[PDB]
Amino acid sequence: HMDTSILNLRYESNHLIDLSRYASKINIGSKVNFDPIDKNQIQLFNLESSKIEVILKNAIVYNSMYENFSTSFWIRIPKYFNSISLNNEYTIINCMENNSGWKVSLNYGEIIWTLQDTQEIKQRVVFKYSQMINISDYINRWIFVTITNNRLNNSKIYINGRLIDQKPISNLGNIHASNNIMFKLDGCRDTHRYIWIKYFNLFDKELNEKEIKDLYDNQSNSGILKDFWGDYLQYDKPYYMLNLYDPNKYVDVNNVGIRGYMYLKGPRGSVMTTNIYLNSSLYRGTKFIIKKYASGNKDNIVRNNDRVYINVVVKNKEYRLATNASQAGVEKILSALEIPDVGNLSQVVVMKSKNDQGITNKCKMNLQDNNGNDIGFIGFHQFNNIAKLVASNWYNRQIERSSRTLGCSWEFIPVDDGWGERPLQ
Numbered sequence: 408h409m410d411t412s413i414l415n416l417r418y419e420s421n422h423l424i425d426l427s428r429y430a431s432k433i434n435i436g437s438k439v440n441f442d443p444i445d446k447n448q449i450q451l452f453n454l455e456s457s458k459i460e461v462i463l464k465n466a467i468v469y470n471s472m473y474e475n476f477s478t479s480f481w482i483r484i485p486k487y488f489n490s491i492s493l494n495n496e497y498t499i500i501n502c503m504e505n506n507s508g509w510k511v512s513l514n515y516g517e518i519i520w521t522l523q524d525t526q527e528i529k530q531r532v533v534f535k536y537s538q539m540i541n542i543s544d545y546i547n548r549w550i551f552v553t554i555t556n557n558r559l560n561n562s563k564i565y566i567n568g569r570l571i572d573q574k575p576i577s578n579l580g581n582i583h584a585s586n587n588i589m590f591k592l593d594g595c596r597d598t599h600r601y602i603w604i605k606y607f608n609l610f611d612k613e614l615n616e617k618e619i620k621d622l623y624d625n626q627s628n629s630g631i632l633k634d635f636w637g638d639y640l641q642y643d644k645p646y647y648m649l650n651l652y653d654p655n656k657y658v659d660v661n662n663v664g665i666r667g668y669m670y671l672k673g674p675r676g677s678v679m680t681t682n683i684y685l686n687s688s689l690y691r692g693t694k695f696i697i698k699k700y701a702s703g704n705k706d707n708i709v710r711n712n713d714r715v716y717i718n719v720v721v722k723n724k725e726y727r728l729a730t731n732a733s734q735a736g737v738e739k740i741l742s743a744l745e746i747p748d749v750g751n752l753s754q755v756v757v758m759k760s761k762n763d764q765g766i767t768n769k770c771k772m773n774l775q776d777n778n779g780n781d782i783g784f785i786g787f788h789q790f791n792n793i794a795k796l797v798a799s800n801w802y803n804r805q806i807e808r809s810s811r812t813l814g815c816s817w818e819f820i821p822v823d824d825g826w827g828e829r830p831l832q
């Protein structure tokens with residue numbers, strides 16, 4: 408019931424603007440890049456001209472001993488690859504003037520908030536994430552950041568709606584920030600470093616936990632499905648597959664045609680740079696390509712509830728994911744068929760957002776027959792030492808967001824420069 412955002416930076420009518428009543432002025436550098444499909448996604452390189460300056464009206468400049476405030480934004484931080492990034496804190500969003508104010512900085516495996524008063528008393532809160540982890544929720548993936556400040560007690564950093572760190576700030580006196588917010592990599596020794604950022608907001612209160620969860624939901628709610636990294640899922644784009652129940656396995660094929668089958672096998676194997684990262688390999692297994700069937704949209708974005716076909720790439724040729732639903736048993740084993748020879752086999756897939764918390768990249772694929780009847784969500788089943796891919800209505804009968812729907816939840820991983828792995832072939 409009360410307008411609390413004092414800066415709401417959004418792309419509208421061909422420009423990045425402040426949608427708040429204050430209409431703060433935006434100065435964009437010549438080397439800022441916007442994502443072609445989602446122009447709210449902004450890429451800042453390690454270059455002087457890759458910067459955005461927001462000029463705040465005097466009335467909303469922070470100059471206070473007592474006023475509470477918060478900031479929120481989404482960020483996508485490429486994996487750290489090189490030892491030059493160790494012990495190298497670099498500013499990314501700066502509202503410091505004359506050694507007072509606030510800033511967001513990054514370091515190897517860290518997002519850091521710093522406040523500083525006009526007597527050089529500082530406090531930091533820090534989110535630390537590991538690069539020695541099989542599959543990370545955070546590395547090179549869109550994550551939601553929220554930072555809140557209550558002058559009588561704590562500053563708090565939340566990640567994806569969850570409190571990560573809080574520290575006292577009650578001893579800080581007057582904080583007098585800048586009338587400019589500078590979005591720019593400052594002090595970064597890795598010449599190849601960049602970030603992606605979106606939906607920057609400032610608020611004139613300490614947001615509460617409910618408000619933050621609502622913001623997280625509202626800014627991630629979409630009728631558009633997303634890939635593993637959090638970008639829009641697309642038609643006609645090759646993806647490697649991740650199953651959420653068995654994330655250390657990958658999809659392979661045991662022969663094409665109706666007597667062959669798709670299956671999961673593992674482990675993935677590792678990608679590494681000593682002392683810098685150790686992760687599971689993501690570019691493994693047969694690539695899938697999502698093909699238009701029913702959608703009347705002319706763009707190539709995959710939307711929630713779109714009915715599609717799934718192609719499987721085998722030896723640089725596309726096959727159709729399909730099954731004969733008449734086979735005995737609820738689990739219908741999936742095959743990779745020659746496209747011209749699919750005939751009346753079941754092949755139409757409803758792409759469904761799991762509608763879990765956060766980004767709409769947890770995908771379910773409901774296979775339907777040619778009369779539109781459900782054959783079931785695509786998952787896997789042990790026969791009995793091989794984990795074959797199946798469509799099964801058993802999944803459709805399970806409790807939502809429970810253990811028994813992990814097996815039919817998938818993510819789609821395209822090659823991305825922020826991950827840096829080299830495919831084996």
Ligand SMILES: CC(=O)N[C@H]1[C@H](O[C@@H]2[C@H](O[C@]3(C(=O)O)C[C@H](O)[C@@H](NC(C)=O)[C@H]([C@H](O)[C@H](O)CO)O3)[C@@H](O)[C@H](O[C@H]3[C@H](O)[C@@H](O)[C@H](O)O[C@@H]3CO)O[C@@H]2CO)O[C@H](CO)[C@H](O)[C@@H]1O[C@@H]1O[C@H](CO)[C@H](O)[C@H](O[C@]2(C(=O)O)C[C@H](O)[C@@H](NC(C)=O)[C@H]([C@H](O)[C@H](O)CO)O2)[C@H]1O
Nearest residue numbers: 652737738786787788789799801802810811812813814815
């Ligand atoms: C065989 C089996 O265990 N499940 C298969 C099921 O078999 C039936 C009975 O199993 C259920 C059921 O009725 O569906 C499973 C339900 O979840 C239970 N409900 C609840 C609320 O818990 C239900 C109850 O326990 C019933 O009241 C029990 O009757 O049971 C199964 O117990 C029963 O087995 C008989 C047995 O045949 C007899 O010999 C014996 O005398 O008595 C027992 C008990 O009666 O058989 C029932 C019919 O055969 O049948 C369905 C089809 O209807 C499925 O095949 C089901 O297997 C599941 O298949 C789906 C795909 O359809 C997936 O492949 C599941 O795999 C995963 C998954 O969850 O995705 C993969 C995971 O890797 C695996 N995890 C681990 C750690 O290994 C999980 C795991 O089983 C759990 O789901 C953990 O989340 O499974 C696959 O399990």
Ligand SMILES: [Mg+2]
Nearest residue numbers: 624627628765
């Ligand atoms: Mg939601």
